[PDB]
Amino acid sequence: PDHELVVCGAPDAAALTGLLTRVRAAATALSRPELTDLAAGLAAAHRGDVPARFAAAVRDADGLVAALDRALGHLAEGGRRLLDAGRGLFLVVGGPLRVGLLFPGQAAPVHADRGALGHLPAEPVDTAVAQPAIIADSLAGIRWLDRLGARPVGALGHSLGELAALSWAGALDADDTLALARARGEAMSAATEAPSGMLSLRADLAAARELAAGTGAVVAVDNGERHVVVAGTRPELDRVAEAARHAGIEATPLAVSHAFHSPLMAPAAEALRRAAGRLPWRRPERPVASTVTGAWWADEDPVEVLVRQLTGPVRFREALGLLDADLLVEVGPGRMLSALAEAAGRTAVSLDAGAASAAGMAAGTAALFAAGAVDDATPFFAGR
Ligand SMILES: [Cl-]
């Protein structure tokens, strides 16, 4: 792999300081192969009840020494919790922490991302292909969490990702979830009755509703105080873009040929209802914060919820606020939701399941171990 995962731990902070000092001395000038041997040994030796924990994803021995210097500096100042998702460095004394899962949906590319630089097109996703492709990578990430025995507090899924979150929660098996994703992507790829799309606003929900009022456009995706997407026909979107320029709000056209999460998706929701009502749904057994209802899942009919999902807004801000978690781990390809969660002020890292780079699998697994949601990092060293 291109990133190595280095874990260890000790009974308390003073003991962890001693151990990290020793690992730092031993790491200076190790070759890559030597680093892998050290890391594989440390994962074998530091598993089970490991009270105080360090984990880092590193490119090389110098990266490891850098990460240890940061962790040592932290402990020296009496710190007991250092969570740096963007550097894949995690240190926790007195855990476990609460870890929540994020299940992504389809990417939301900008139509013509400048470039000149703006201060001075992209093709839409093929949704019938993309939806089952993303769900397959998320189901691979759930298998990784199952191999590790992960113990998160709850999950949420963005749009499509709610299907994976329900599968993780036991409402539907993997094969049925993948088949439902195929059906959903086929339904949602059908043309809308008239040309339509989506427009991203750097603004909050009330500001978006003010710009959309009277235009025909509607809120499609509520991602947070800094990001709301509206949807509608092209004339409707043009009204909002004009209103946004007058109000001084940045409106960015997205590369999509559908007003997803608007009433123009009603025909697709009818087709989805047929596919969904044929499945042996079960009550979820783990907490799911729905981005359809903005509330915890509780005895809902899944057919009704997943059908009105298509026409109503994605309540990612509300669902993310419900999920009480010191650390979030994204379980899916890419880092779409970790980016969204970071923009809401939360700490998040992506496993980036199915990626060429082991960057995400090393960082994500480091986060799960240091937070105490998994007890054993040896699966990262298996079967290379
Ligand atoms: Cl709302």
Sheet containing 4-10, strands listed edge to edge, beginning at the edge strand earlier in sequence: 4-10, 52-58, 89-92, 81-84
Distance 206 CA to ligand 1 centre (A): 9
Give the Cα separation of 69 and 340 in Å (integer): 30
- Closest to 369 (Cα-Cα) out of 137, 72, 40, 43: 43
Active-site residue, from 159, 200, 262, 290: 159
Buried b (16+ CB within 10 A) or exposed e, 319-358: bbebbebbbbbbbbbbbbbbebbbebebbbbbbbbbeeeb
159 belongs to the catalytic site: yes
Nearest Cα neighbor of 155 from 99, 95, 236, 204 is 99
Residue 46 CB contacts under 8 Å (≥ 6 apart), including other chains: 7, 8, 9, 53, 377
How large is the greatest C-alpha to C-alpha distance in the chain, in angstroms? 67
Of 145, 172, 154, 164, nearest to 105 (Cα)?
164
Resolution in angstroms comes to 1.5
Instruction: Give the Cα separation of 99 and 47 in Å (integer).
Output: 18
- List, in order, residues 6 or more apart from 325 with CB less than 8 Å away: 97, 98, 99, 100, 152, 153, 154, 346
CB–CB of 59/2 below 8 Å?
yes
Q: For residue 229, list its beta bridge partners.
A: 200, 221
Let me know: does 92 contact 71? Beta carbons within 8 Å: no
C-beta atoms surrounding 210 within 10 Å: 14
CB 374 within 8 A of CB 105: no
Distance (Å) from CA 312 to ligand 1 centroid: 9
246: annotated active-site residue:
no
- Cα–Cα distance between 11 and 93 in angstroms, integer? 9
Of 286, 278, 86, the C-alpha closest to 170 is 286
Fold for 1-384, please state it: Malonyl-Coenzyme A Acyl Carrier Protein; domain 2 (3.40.366)
**Ligand 1 center–CA 291 separation, angstroms:** 11
Q: Where are the domains of the chain?
A: 1-384
Beta carbons within 8 Å of 313's beta carbon, 6+ residues apart:
218, 219, 220, 221, 222, 261
Q: How far is the CA of 254 from the centre of ligand 1 (A)?
A: 21
Torsion of CA 31, 36, 42, 48, to 10 degrees: 160
Yes or no: say if 92 and 153 are a contact pair by the CB < 8 Å rule. no
> Do the strands 196-201 and 251-253 form a parallel or antiparallel pair, or are they unpaired?
antiparallel
207: amino acid identity, one letter: A
CA of 213 to the centre of ligand 1 (A): 13
Measure the N-to-C terminal CA separation of the chain; round to a whole number of Å.
8
3, 74, 158, 261: the active-site residue:
261
* 229 CA → ligand 1 middle, Å: 12
Q: Could you tell me the distance, in angstroms and rounded to a whole number, from the CA of residue 308 to the centre of ligand 1?
A: 14
Judge contact between 111 and 157, C-beta under 8 A: no
Measure 189 CA to ligand 1 centroid, in angstroms. 25
